[PDB]
Amino acid sequence: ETLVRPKPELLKLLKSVGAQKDTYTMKEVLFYLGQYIMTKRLYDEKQQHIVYCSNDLLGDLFGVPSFSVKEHRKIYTMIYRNLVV
Amino acid sequence: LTFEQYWAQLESAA
Ligand SMILES: *N(C)CC(=O)NCc1ccc(CNC(=O)CN(*)C)cc1
């Protein structure tokens, strides 16, 4: 499987929930980001496909106040803007 | 939970 390299701010977010490396598979990037969203309770308790991130570092990195987990192409594009070229 | 089931669908696209 192909390895990708996070920029310094995205790297610090993954290491806050146990990550130990400088490079990752895309399945590993999605594992640590999901664990981050659930331990900080950023998902809406009633409608659980909505993530609210205005007052979190995740909102500064992605450039939005909120997003839907149904929008698969938009989420892969937000991750790509945060990888080393 | 419902969040974990929506997030598993992204995993399928990798
Ligand atoms: N997709 C390729 C499989 C994968 O990588 N799974 C990620 C994963 C596995 C297990 C958990 C367990 N977490 C919970 O049960 C908490 N949510 C209810 C999370 C993610």
Coordinates of N, CA, C and O in Angstrom, one line a residue, chain A residues 27 30 34 37 43 48-49 69-70 72 76, chain B residues 1-4 6-7 9-11 13-14:
Chain A
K27 N -5.5 4.4 4.9 CA -6.3 3.6 5.9 C -5.8 4.0 7.3 O -6.7 4.2 8.3
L30 N -7.0 7.8 8.2 CA -8.5 7.8 8.5 C -8.7 7.2 9.9 O -9.6 7.7 10.6
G34 N -10.4 9.5 12.8 CA -11.7 9.1 13.4 C -11.7 9.0 15.0 O -12.7 9.3 15.6
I37 N -11.9 12.7 16.4 CA -13.2 13.2 16.4 C -14.1 12.6 17.5 O -15.0 13.2 18.1
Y43 N -18.7 15.2 16.9 CA -19.9 14.8 16.2 C -21.2 15.2 17.0 O -21.2 15.3 18.2
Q48 N -25.7 12.0 13.5 CA -24.2 11.7 13.8 C -23.3 11.7 12.6 O -22.1 11.4 12.7
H49 N -23.9 12.0 11.4 CA -23.1 12.3 10.1 C -22.5 13.7 10.1 O -21.6 14.0 9.3
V69 N -20.1 13.6 6.8 CA -19.3 12.3 6.6 C -19.8 11.7 5.3 O -19.0 10.9 4.6
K70 N -21.0 12.0 4.8 CA -21.5 11.5 3.5 C -20.7 12.0 2.3 O -20.7 11.3 1.2
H72 N -17.8 12.1 0.5 CA -16.5 11.4 0.5 C -15.4 12.1 -0.3 O -14.2 12.3 0.2
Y76 N -11.6 13.7 1.2 CA -10.3 13.3 0.6 C -9.5 14.6 0.1 O -8.3 14.7 0.3
Chain B
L1 N -21.5 2.9 17.1 CA -22.6 3.9 17.1 C -22.8 4.4 15.7 O -22.2 3.8 14.7
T2 N -23.6 5.4 15.5 CA -24.0 5.8 14.1 C -22.8 6.6 13.5 O -22.6 6.3 12.3
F3 N -22.1 7.5 14.2 CA -20.9 8.1 13.7 C -19.9 7.0 13.2 O -19.3 7.2 12.1
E4 N -19.6 6.0 14.0 CA -18.6 5.0 13.6 C -19.0 4.2 12.3 O -18.2 3.9 11.4
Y6 N -21.0 5.5 9.7 CA -20.8 6.5 8.6 C -19.3 6.6 8.2 O -18.9 6.6 7.0
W7 N -18.4 6.7 9.2 CA -16.9 6.8 9.1 C -16.4 5.5 8.4 O -15.4 5.5 7.6
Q9 N -17.7 3.8 6.0 CA -18.0 3.9 4.6 C -16.8 4.7 3.9 O -16.5 4.3 2.7
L10 N -16.2 5.7 4.5 CA -15.0 6.4 3.9 C -13.8 5.4 3.7 O -13.0 5.6 2.7
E11 N -13.7 4.5 4.7 CA -12.6 3.5 4.7 C -12.7 2.6 3.4 O -11.6 2.3 2.8
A13 N -13.6 3.5 0.5 CA -13.1 4.3 -0.7 C -11.5 4.3 -0.8 O -11.0 4.7 -1.8
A14 N -10.8 3.8 0.3 CA -9.3 3.6 0.3 C -8.9 2.2 -0.2 O -7.9 1.6 0.1

